[PDB]
Amino acid sequence: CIQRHRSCRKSSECCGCSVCQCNLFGQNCQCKSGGLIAC
């Protein structure tokens, strides 16, 4: 799966309670943390 620190196409494409978002230019969508202890 896509780590919470690698480019992705959708927040769903990320193991654990991680999400994916782009920059101000709606580009460079990178995965991020969400809540390992409490989602």
Helix (H), strand (E), coil (C) string for 1-39: CCCCCCECCCCCCCCCCCEEECCCCCCCCEEECCCCCCC
Range of the domain at 30: 1-39
Residue with tokens 């896509």: 2
- Do the Cβ atoms of 4 and 33 come closer than 8 Å? yes
**Angle, vertex CA 33, rays to CA 27 and CA 34, nearest 5:** 110
Q: How many domains does the chain have?
A: 1
List the beta bridge partners of residue 20: 31
CATH number at residue 35: 4.10.40
